[PDB]
Amino acid sequence: LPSILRRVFYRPYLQIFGQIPQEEMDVALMIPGNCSMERGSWAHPEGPVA
Amino acid sequence: LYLSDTWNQCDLLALTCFLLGVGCRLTPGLFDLGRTVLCLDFMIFTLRLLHIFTVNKQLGPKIVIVSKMMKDVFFFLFFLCVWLVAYGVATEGILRPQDRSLPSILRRVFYRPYLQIFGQIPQEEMDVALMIPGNCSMERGSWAHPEGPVAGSCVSQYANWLVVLLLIVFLLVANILLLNLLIAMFSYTFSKVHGNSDLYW
Amino acid sequence: GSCVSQYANWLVVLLLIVFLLVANILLLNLLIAMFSYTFSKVHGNSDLYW
Amino acid sequence: HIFTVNKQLGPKIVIVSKMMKDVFFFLFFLCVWLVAYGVATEGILRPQDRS
Amino acid sequence: SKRWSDFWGAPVTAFLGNVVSYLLFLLLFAHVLLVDFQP
């Protein structure tokens, strides 16, 4: 629950002030991987809370 | 009449600092002091070049209106420095860094919240969730270890959400209230002054 | 630079504070004030000329 | 220059060229202050790579 | 003696020569303070 509250309310707030994490939300700046036991493509971002 | 002025006090100041710089430079024990004072003197000789161009038609009256904005700037610095003390000491207090030198505290109280106005926001220095924990303190409580040589060697984890909430409130008041109210005061003062500054030029 | 001096470094930090004050506060906000003044002064004659 | 015939975008493109005297004041005050800060900071520091 | 004297006799070219000479002073002061400053 607080990790979702961070990624919904706290990260888009800091994007007004020029804090734009591209590596947390764009696959092309990331590496792929078999990181989910589920159907579909998945990829692995950088950051402890991302 | 020569001492009553301001730009003759400026041109006097550039040559006092010049002779102080050379006078230290030729002594064998003060080489670094003379090189530093000459490097401060170059700015004064460069700022003289604004007064030279006041005779031009296009750049003339605008350079006249530059000096009449400093009362609005001094209000901005008053409201800023009060709010910068308040945010700085509260955030330095809720966190408990272990490196507690006097100039390291002065950096983390006055210098780091100053650069957060200009978009320099270190999150990894002041948020536990972007850090790794550790047994870095011989003391009771939770502790964690941030990144950076001057960010304090070991910081506290208790009630960290209030530090994040002070970061949101600081960016709201500083980067929205103070800056946009400063643009509004420059707009008002410029239209109030522009007539008399053209007559005076 | 491969190697830099440590003598009187606090004056370098203090010049960084003064530079950000004059450039990012005086010059930019005085430029917005001059664009506001000039735009309201000119807007009538530019509509007639267009 | 092609789109100056349009109604909505027309007069605004006309007013763009009349702002350059304010921009040239900005560059004058900037370039003086940029020389002063630049050479003083490059002087107090002493870098060894001096190309 | 007159056309030469009435080009350089104006206050404009005295101003312009004052600026160019002062810019060369700043260029020299930077060349000393950045390149060859011997201990």
Side-chain angles (χ1 to χ4, degrees):
Chain A
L1 183 65
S3 176
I4 290 170
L5 295 178
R6 184 183 295 269
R7 288 195 296 273
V8 173
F9 295 103
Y10 179 69
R11 187 178 69 190
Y13 184 78
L14 293 175
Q15 290 182 357
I16 304 169
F17 303 100
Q19 304 292 318
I20 300 170
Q22 303 176 7
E23 294 178 353
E24 291 183 353
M25 59 185 291
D26 194 359
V27 174
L29 299 176
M30 286 160 54
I31 54 171
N34 196 0
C35 53
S36 179
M37 289 299 293
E38 198 173 4
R39 185 177 293 111
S41 296
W42 296 93
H44 178 77
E46 295 293 328
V49 79
Chain B
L1 292 182
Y2 189 78
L3 191 63
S4 66
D5 297 333
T6 56
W7 286 91
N8 292 118
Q9 293 180 357
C10 179
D11 202 4
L12 201 281
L13 178 61
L15 297 179
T16 59
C17 296
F18 193 85
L19 296 179
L20 184 67
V22 182
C24 295
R25 183 256 192 272
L26 291 177
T27 61
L30 298 179
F31 176 70
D32 287 331
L33 185 63
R35 181 178 54 82
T36 299
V37 171
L38 290 177
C39 289
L40 289 176
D41 199 8
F42 183 78
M43 296 175 69
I44 301 168
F45 282 101
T46 309
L47 267 63
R48 183 69 174 87
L49 195 63
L50 289 174
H51 182 75
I52 291 172
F53 275 96
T54 63
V55 192
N56 194 1
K57 288 292 292 297
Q58 185 178 2
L59 297 179
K62 299 173 185 175
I63 295 171
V64 173
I65 306 166
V66 175
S67 70
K68 297 182 177 68
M69 299 296 168
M70 299 303 290
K71 291 186 177 181
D72 299 333
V73 177
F74 288 154
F75 169 70
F76 174 73
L77 295 177
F78 173 71
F79 207 96
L80 185 65
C81 288
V82 170
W83 184 254
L84 202 68
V85 163
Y87 170 75
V89 179
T91 303
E92 180 66 24
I94 295 173
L95 297 180
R96 293 183 66 193
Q98 294 303 111
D99 282 331
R100 285 178 176 173
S101 297
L102 183 65
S104 176
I105 290 170
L106 295 178
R107 185 183 295 269
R108 288 195 296 273
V109 173
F110 295 103
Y111 179 69
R112 187 178 68 190
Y114 184 78
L115 293 175
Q116 290 182 357
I117 304 169
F118 303 100
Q120 304 292 318
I121 300 170
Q123 303 176 7
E124 294 178 353
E125 291 183 353
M126 59 185 291
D127 194 359
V128 174
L130 299 176
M131 286 160 54
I132 54 171
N135 196 1
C136 53
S137 179
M138 289 299 293
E139 198 173 4
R140 185 177 293 111
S142 296
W143 296 93
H145 178 77
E147 295 293 328
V150 79
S153 66
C154 177
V155 86
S156 174
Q157 299 185 3
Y158 179 76
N160 196 18
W161 59 269
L162 190 59
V163 176
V164 176
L165 193 61
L166 283 175
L167 192 273
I168 287 174
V169 173
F170 175 73
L171 292 178
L172 177 59
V173 175
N175 276 318
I176 288 165
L177 273 173
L178 271 70
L179 294 182
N180 299 322
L181 189 65
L182 185 60
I183 298 174
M185 286 185 282
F186 276 173
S187 295
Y188 179 74
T189 305
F190 193 82
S191 67
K192 185 178 74 177
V193 167
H194 190 70
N196 284 316
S197 292
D198 283 331
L199 268 74
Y200 180 74
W201 183 75
Chain C
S2 66
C3 177
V4 86
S5 174
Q6 299 185 3
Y7 179 76
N9 196 18
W10 59 269
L11 190 59
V12 176
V13 176
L14 193 61
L15 283 175
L16 192 273
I17 287 174
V18 174
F19 175 73
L20 292 178
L21 177 59
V22 175
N24 276 318
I25 288 165
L26 273 173
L27 271 70
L28 294 182
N29 299 322
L30 189 65
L31 185 60
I32 298 174
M34 286 185 282
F35 276 173
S36 295
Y37 179 74
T38 305
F39 193 82
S40 67
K41 185 178 74 177
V42 167
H43 190 70
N45 284 316
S46 292
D47 283 331
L48 268 74
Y49 180 74
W50 183 75
Chain D
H1 182 75
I2 291 172
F3 275 96
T4 63
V5 192
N6 194 1
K7 288 292 292 296
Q8 185 178 2
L9 297 179
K12 299 173 185 175
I13 295 171
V14 173
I15 306 166
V16 175
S17 70
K18 297 182 177 68
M19 299 296 168
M20 299 303 290
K21 291 186 177 181
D22 299 333
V23 177
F24 288 154
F25 169 70
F26 174 73
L27 295 177
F28 173 71
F29 207 96
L30 185 65
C31 288
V32 170
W33 184 254
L34 202 68
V35 163
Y37 170 75
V39 179
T41 303
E42 180 66 24
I44 295 173
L45 297 180
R46 293 183 66 193
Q48 294 303 111
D49 282 331
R50 285 178 176 173
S51 297
Chain E
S1 294
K2 185 176 183 293
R3 187 176 179 89
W4 176 262
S5 180
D6 289 330
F7 185 75
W8 297 90
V12 178
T13 59
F15 167 72
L16 198 148
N18 205 173
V19 172
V20 171
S21 64
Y22 194 81
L23 293 179
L24 292 178
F25 171 69
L26 290 179
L27 181 61
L28 184 69
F29 202 92
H31 174 80
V32 170
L33 194 61
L34 298 179
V35 177
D36 48 355
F37 195 75
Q38 296 178 358

Short mmCIF file of all heavy atoms in Angstrom, two decimals, chain B residues 3 5 19 28 32 39 55 66 77 82 84 89 91 100 105 121 141 143 146 152 176 196:
data_model
loop_
_atom_site.label_atom_id
_atom_site.label_comp_id
_atom_site.label_asym_id
_atom_site.label_seq_id
_atom_site.Cartn_x
_atom_site.Cartn_y
_atom_site.Cartn_z
N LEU B 3 34.24 61.50 -3.34
CA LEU B 3 33.95 60.42 -2.41
C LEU B 3 32.45 60.25 -2.20
O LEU B 3 32.01 59.18 -1.76
CB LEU B 3 34.66 60.66 -1.07
CG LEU B 3 34.71 59.56 0.00
CD1 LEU B 3 35.49 58.35 -0.52
CD2 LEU B 3 35.33 60.07 1.30
N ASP B 5 30.23 59.81 -4.40
CA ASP B 5 29.61 59.07 -5.49
C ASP B 5 29.51 57.58 -5.13
O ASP B 5 29.70 57.19 -3.98
CB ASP B 5 30.39 59.29 -6.78
CG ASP B 5 30.38 60.73 -7.23
OD1 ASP B 5 29.42 61.46 -6.90
OD2 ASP B 5 31.34 61.15 -7.91
N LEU B 19 46.26 46.71 -5.64
CA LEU B 19 47.54 46.90 -4.95
C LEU B 19 47.66 45.98 -3.75
O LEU B 19 48.78 45.60 -3.37
CB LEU B 19 47.69 48.36 -4.53
CG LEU B 19 47.76 49.32 -5.71
CD1 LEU B 19 47.90 50.75 -5.23
CD2 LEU B 19 48.88 48.95 -6.67
N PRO B 28 57.02 36.41 -0.30
CA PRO B 28 57.19 34.98 -0.54
C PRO B 28 56.25 34.11 0.28
O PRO B 28 56.07 32.93 -0.03
CB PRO B 28 58.65 34.73 -0.14
CG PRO B 28 58.92 35.77 0.89
CD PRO B 28 58.14 36.98 0.48
N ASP B 32 49.33 32.46 -2.33
CA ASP B 32 47.95 32.05 -2.53
C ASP B 32 46.96 33.15 -2.18
O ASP B 32 45.90 33.24 -2.81
CB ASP B 32 47.67 30.80 -1.69
CG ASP B 32 48.32 29.56 -2.26
OD1 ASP B 32 48.50 29.50 -3.49
OD2 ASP B 32 48.65 28.65 -1.47
N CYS B 39 41.84 37.31 -8.24
CA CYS B 39 40.68 36.67 -8.85
C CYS B 39 39.38 37.32 -8.40
O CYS B 39 38.39 37.31 -9.14
CB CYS B 39 40.66 35.18 -8.54
SG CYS B 39 41.93 34.25 -9.38
N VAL B 55 25.69 55.12 -21.80
CA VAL B 55 25.55 56.21 -22.74
C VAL B 55 24.83 55.76 -24.01
O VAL B 55 24.27 56.60 -24.73
CB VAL B 55 26.96 56.76 -23.05
CG1 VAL B 55 26.90 58.08 -23.78
CG2 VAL B 55 27.75 56.90 -21.79
N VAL B 66 17.76 48.58 -13.64
CA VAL B 66 18.23 47.39 -12.92
C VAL B 66 18.43 47.65 -11.43
O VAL B 66 18.07 46.82 -10.60
CB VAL B 66 19.52 46.86 -13.57
CG1 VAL B 66 20.09 45.71 -12.79
CG2 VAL B 66 19.22 46.37 -14.95
N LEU B 77 14.78 37.81 -0.20
CA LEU B 77 15.79 37.18 0.64
C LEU B 77 15.37 37.13 2.09
O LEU B 77 15.77 36.22 2.81
CB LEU B 77 17.11 37.92 0.52
CG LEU B 77 17.70 37.82 -0.87
CD1 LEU B 77 18.96 38.62 -0.95
CD2 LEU B 77 17.96 36.37 -1.20
N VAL B 82 14.26 33.33 6.36
CA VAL B 82 13.47 32.87 7.49
C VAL B 82 12.97 31.45 7.24
O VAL B 82 13.15 30.56 8.07
CB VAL B 82 12.31 33.84 7.77
CG1 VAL B 82 11.36 33.24 8.77
CG2 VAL B 82 12.85 35.13 8.31
N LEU B 84 14.14 29.28 5.21
CA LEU B 84 15.24 28.37 4.97
C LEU B 84 15.86 27.91 6.28
O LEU B 84 16.32 26.77 6.38
CB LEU B 84 16.29 29.05 4.11
CG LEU B 84 17.28 28.25 3.31
CD1 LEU B 84 16.50 27.59 2.23
CD2 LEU B 84 18.29 29.19 2.71
N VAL B 89 16.70 23.55 9.93
CA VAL B 89 17.00 23.03 11.25
C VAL B 89 16.00 21.94 11.65
O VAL B 89 16.35 21.00 12.36
CB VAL B 89 17.03 24.19 12.26
CG1 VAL B 89 17.32 23.73 13.66
CG2 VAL B 89 18.07 25.20 11.84
N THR B 91 14.65 19.72 9.52
CA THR B 91 15.00 18.49 8.81
C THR B 91 16.31 17.92 9.33
O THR B 91 16.44 16.70 9.49
CB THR B 91 15.07 18.77 7.32
OG1 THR B 91 13.82 19.29 6.89
CG2 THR B 91 15.33 17.50 6.55
N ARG B 100 29.01 15.02 12.94
CA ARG B 100 28.47 16.25 13.49
C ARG B 100 29.53 17.33 13.64
O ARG B 100 29.64 17.94 14.71
CB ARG B 100 27.82 15.99 14.85
CG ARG B 100 26.47 15.30 14.77
CD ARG B 100 25.95 15.05 16.17
NE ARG B 100 24.61 14.48 16.19
CZ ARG B 100 24.01 14.06 17.30
NH1 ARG B 100 24.64 14.13 18.47
NH2 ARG B 100 22.79 13.56 17.24
N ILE B 105 27.29 20.57 9.54
CA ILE B 105 25.93 20.95 9.89
C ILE B 105 25.52 22.21 9.14
O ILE B 105 24.40 22.29 8.61
CB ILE B 105 25.80 21.11 11.41
CG1 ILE B 105 25.89 19.74 12.08
CG2 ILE B 105 24.50 21.77 11.80
CD1 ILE B 105 26.02 19.80 13.57
N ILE B 121 17.67 18.37 -6.05
CA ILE B 121 16.97 17.71 -4.96
C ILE B 121 17.62 16.36 -4.69
O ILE B 121 17.39 15.41 -5.45
CB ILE B 121 15.48 17.56 -5.26
CG1 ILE B 121 14.85 18.92 -5.49
CG2 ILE B 121 14.77 16.87 -4.13
CD1 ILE B 121 13.47 18.85 -6.01
N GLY B 141 17.70 2.38 18.60
CA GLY B 141 16.86 2.82 17.50
C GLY B 141 17.29 2.22 16.18
O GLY B 141 18.30 1.52 16.08
N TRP B 143 18.63 2.65 12.31
CA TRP B 143 19.58 3.53 11.67
C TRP B 143 19.80 3.05 10.24
O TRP B 143 19.63 1.88 9.94
CB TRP B 143 20.90 3.57 12.44
CG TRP B 143 20.77 4.14 13.81
CD1 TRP B 143 20.55 3.44 14.95
CD2 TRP B 143 20.84 5.51 14.18
NE1 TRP B 143 20.48 4.30 16.02
CE2 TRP B 143 20.66 5.58 15.57
CE3 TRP B 143 21.05 6.70 13.47
CZ2 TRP B 143 20.67 6.77 16.27
CZ3 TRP B 143 21.06 7.88 14.17
CH2 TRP B 143 20.87 7.91 15.55
N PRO B 146 23.32 6.51 4.29
CA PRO B 146 23.06 7.16 3.00
C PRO B 146 24.29 7.23 2.11
O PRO B 146 25.38 6.80 2.47
CB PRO B 146 22.61 8.57 3.41
CG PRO B 146 23.31 8.81 4.66
CD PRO B 146 23.43 7.50 5.38
N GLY B 152 26.34 12.85 6.04
CA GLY B 152 26.25 12.17 7.32
C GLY B 152 26.41 10.67 7.16
O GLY B 152 25.87 10.05 6.26
N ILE B 176 6.81 28.01 -5.53
CA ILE B 176 5.55 28.48 -6.09
C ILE B 176 5.14 29.83 -5.53
O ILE B 176 4.91 30.77 -6.28
CB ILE B 176 4.44 27.42 -5.92
CG1 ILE B 176 4.71 26.26 -6.86
CG2 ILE B 176 3.10 28.00 -6.16
CD1 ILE B 176 3.94 25.05 -6.55
N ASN B 196 9.64 57.60 -14.90
CA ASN B 196 10.65 58.44 -14.26
C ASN B 196 12.06 58.00 -14.59
O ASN B 196 12.98 58.82 -14.57
CB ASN B 196 10.46 58.44 -12.75
CG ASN B 196 9.32 59.30 -12.31
OD1 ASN B 196 9.14 60.41 -12.80
ND2 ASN B 196 8.52 58.80 -11.39
#
